[PDB]
Amino acid sequence: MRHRKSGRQLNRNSSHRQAMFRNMAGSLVRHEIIKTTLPKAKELRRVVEPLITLAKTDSVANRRLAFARTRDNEIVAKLFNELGPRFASRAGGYTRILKCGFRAGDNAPMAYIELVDRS
Amino acid sequence: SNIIKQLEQEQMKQDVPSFRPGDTVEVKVWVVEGSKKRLQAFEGVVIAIRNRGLHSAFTVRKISNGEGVERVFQTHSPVVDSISVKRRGAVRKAKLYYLRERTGKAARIKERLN
Amino acid sequence: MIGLVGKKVGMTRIFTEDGVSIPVTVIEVEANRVTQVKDLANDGYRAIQVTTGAKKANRVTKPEAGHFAKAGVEAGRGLWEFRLAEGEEFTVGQSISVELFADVKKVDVTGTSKGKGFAGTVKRWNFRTQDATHGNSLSHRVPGSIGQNQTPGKVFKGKKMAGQMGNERVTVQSLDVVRVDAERNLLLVKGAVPGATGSDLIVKPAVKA
Amino acid sequence: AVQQNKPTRSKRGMRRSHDALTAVTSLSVDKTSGEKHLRHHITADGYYRGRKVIAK
Amino acid sequence: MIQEQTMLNVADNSGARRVMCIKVLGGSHRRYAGVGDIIKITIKEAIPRGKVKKGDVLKAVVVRTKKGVRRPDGSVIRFDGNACVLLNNNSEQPIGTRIFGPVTRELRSEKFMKIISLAPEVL
RNA sequence: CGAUGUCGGCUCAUCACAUCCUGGGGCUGAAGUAGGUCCCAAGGGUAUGGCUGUUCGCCAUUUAAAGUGGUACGCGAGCUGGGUUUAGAACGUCGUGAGACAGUUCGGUCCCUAUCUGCCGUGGGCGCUGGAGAACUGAGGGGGGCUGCUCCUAGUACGAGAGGACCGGAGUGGACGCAUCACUGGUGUUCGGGUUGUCAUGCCAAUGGCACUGCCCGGUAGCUAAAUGCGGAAGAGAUAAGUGCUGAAAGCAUCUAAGCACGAAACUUGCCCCGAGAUGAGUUCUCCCUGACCCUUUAAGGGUCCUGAAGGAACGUUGAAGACGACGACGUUGAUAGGCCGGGUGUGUAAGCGCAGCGAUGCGUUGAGCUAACCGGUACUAAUGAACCGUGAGGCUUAACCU
RNA sequence: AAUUCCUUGUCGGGUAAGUUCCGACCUGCACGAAUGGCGUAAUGAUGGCCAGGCUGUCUCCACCCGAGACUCAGUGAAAU
RNA sequence: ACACAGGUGGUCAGGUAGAGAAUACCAAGGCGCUUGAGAGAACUCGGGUGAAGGAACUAGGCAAAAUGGUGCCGUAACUUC
RNA sequence: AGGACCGAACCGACUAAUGUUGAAAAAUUAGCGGAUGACUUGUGGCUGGGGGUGAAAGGCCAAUCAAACCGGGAGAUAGCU
RNA sequence: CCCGGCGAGGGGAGUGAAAAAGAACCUGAAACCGUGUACGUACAAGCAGUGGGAGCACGCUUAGGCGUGUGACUGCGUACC
């Protein structure tokens, strides 16, 4: 059982799971929308939306935080310079989920995850 | 929740002295025998505190008769009667499990002062 | 005598004045509103069907609310029926407070257990594991032998095997009532009632007198 | 650990009695681009619940 | 929580130092033993001249456990020594007369009133 | 003999009663206590180790007892491979020898993805004669059924004393089982700290990667026992053994033949749970559908258009629900999930700066910084307008009313 | 006794308990001196016995991390 | 017999830690091992952690646990020294 | 100095698990031994079946050995299925 | 010529005596697997038949009478070598 629990195993160990969502968030924020699976969609909600909530305060300490999270100054730049002041009023819900059907090569249920204020 | 904590707040004792782990403390507990509610002391070192509101608790370790006596005290229990910090302590770690056996020289705790 | 409707609010402990920590469970008992009074003349058995609470008005159905409307009472979150003991009568529209249990000492908590999924036999039927070492191949938690060589040469009804454990009607008996908070519609009873938090419960009095 | 007879192909239909597929019930019509798509999915053209959700 | 084949500590002047329980008593198949309880024990180690001797088989009462025992407030009193006190096999009462180390209120009784009288510290 | 693997163990058993504990009697060479024996009674219960492959047995120490057998000496498409029983090797022994020894000793491959029956689960179909939604009823079936100890009665009855009751009650255990995480713990590789080596971030600072989670110390939720609630009944009925009552047959007598009683953990119950596929498909309550037409093989018939209800299904978000299904909650009217906010929790005073100190470092800012599943909120995101299914008053036969 | 049938020989050691081992005893069923005898430091993935350490071996398991099992899609055997 | 965890001789010997061609992280260099995608039951495989107990387990401490570096101190029986 | 010590490679194969329609007609995993020598290995060379060779175990002599494989006698023979 | 990926494969169109000779090409059996019709089939126990036989469907017909297909129910019945 998994009573009252959380988290998704994704048939991966945690070092794969951690290093993936690093590159998954770094890819996403770079383009504000990507194509991924519906399972990989709903958990990245629980990844980047706190990083957006982290982007609402540019301390030089928080300059160290996101680089500790991502190891990418460009994303550290883009969150704080743009996305911080962009989403600066939104009480959560910084994303939007578009279940777009199934993947070709394996029948995998794909989805589009985007940002809300993307246009 | 909204109703659970309503029944917990009506049983927490108000007279709780705040402190930290590593602080040498005294506890006066009740002992009833026949009708003799004598108030027996207990005193030693806080090695761990469990913080859950009404269900909060802690643990006092002493070395009595050359032996390590550990009594875990439920904080808001009515049968304890007084908690008295006899000495504060300068620890770093939150729970002092290694002081279950570090005795004599390594039983020493330097006293906090800030 | 009739039982009442509860919900597992949560487990806690009551300290007495004397340094005795009684683990009780908080269970709320709302306004248990009678709905249908089964009888001898129409129904052959004296039983009151009751409800309590409410649900979303866009979720109650036209067969459902018309049963409430025939009673002329608010749609609850569910219907329950208790067999009336004799000399114990009620009207249709009457509701029932927790104060019926103001005089009891032991009660019976009837509740659906937690759901533990497809249990293993060692877990489900309290079996013994075999040895984890000394040559055991692939049989560390299997139950081993299940029948006999050929003369009753089959497996028998009611054999302890794997499967769903829990998620079903169980009833812990003789549970001590501690406090009947009629003010905010609560109930404190010593013990660990079945099921998880917020699962609905049935409190009858003690069946063993 | 293997059959002692041969299973009838009548059983093979009975084994496959529940192995049928399932067609789609209805298709969500996009109210703006007019076309159909899966209920709670976007179109093949970047439309969902009317609006152009993605210039693909 | 003491099962058999457990080394314990001799908490008095009865003469032994190291014992081991061979039989939990007080009912068939009773797995473990706590304080205030009677167990049949061996003697692995006694002083060069004492009241008891190596290999003697006799009863005892357990007075200190590593696992500790509880109190009706929910508090638990844990020790660091699984320690016990010898008794008689028959009159079922101790041998030594100088209790070593503190004891509990779970020891006190009409049974062990003598021992807690000889005890240095009663919790 | 075109293969039916066996010793012992293990894991799971189940049956018998020719009954070990427990239950009820009868007699005694049964004061009591303790027994003896026989009868009734199979509901439950009915050791651990030393030894040896064992079984057995011996022993130690428990229990209330440490029942006996049936089951391929139950149980290898469940396990073990120690014993036996391959090839290697040796002694004793025998045989000239090759060799052999229920002589010994050392070593010595345990295959099988379940078609069926079966069993534990969980579904689908159809049916229950308009449709739907609940409440049930309870046929049947299952669970459950142990006992110690202490005290009371009372050191009383008994007994010369010693000793020591019946009956009746209480309290507390053990063993088991159920519920459960409030507590005590464990876990908690998603939270926090520590630390080694190395690599990288221009560099320091500060981080991260990798080293069994690198090595640790901790630790939330959950899950968990060792943690802690509860259970074993009482009662009823018919009884077994057995004790009787009155009482003939048979002037007596007689528990029986007429009639009447008592009588046990067995039985039926009484407790819990399942349960209308209980086809014998039951009951109650609610809700919904009140169109036109042709056709012929008139028929409980064929079709057309109209209509599509109750509702159900599907979809999405989801669950302390879950292999999948099924089940539950929510789908904007909306707290369903995620985020967010506040909390709490744990971790333990961040970083940055300042300071002291050659420096390591230490102090200040600072219970700081952070915080997983949590508590309370918040629609901020994602839970769509639809569409789908299911229709259009429900055969015959009586009767029984009412017209 | 790697040899003793009887035989769990007897005694001692050890253990609470020892059909094992250890030391005696010789009654050597059926030891024996180059098919060597009796010793022997060292040696040994050698046999047996005992202790300390050590611990899920066990009591009595509990939790978690991965890999399968299970769902879907593509593929697609087997023995019988 | 295979685009098969097997076998195959020689040569080359970066950095840091390190006695080392041990490992451990890397460079150069080369990869990511030809179904995935979920779900996160039992059971199995491989692991990690464990209250109290410490071999009782068992045929048997099998396996696991544990020990482990250098320098120094210290070190028995016996010995064929 | 050493059929010396520890220990890689190397050379083994001791234990356990796995695997047993396998990754594989004997291997993987974890520990194991030897690891200057009675060592190991490359390229050849030689010994032929009642023969070889064998620190011997009927061991080995092309996934085959109490008498290699192939062809022939040969449609051996079969009181047997 | 049309579908399709410029495919594969098909559909036309033409050929030819014929393409039920289209080159995976005389003839196309059986096993096997379909698709359609008929009738049976969701309270029912067994070498699956047989014997009896309800009904439906359906041909002759004079739907009389029967054929044909199905087999409600039921008696009997444990393959073969």
Ligand SMILES: [Mg+2]
């Ligand atoms: Mg199928």
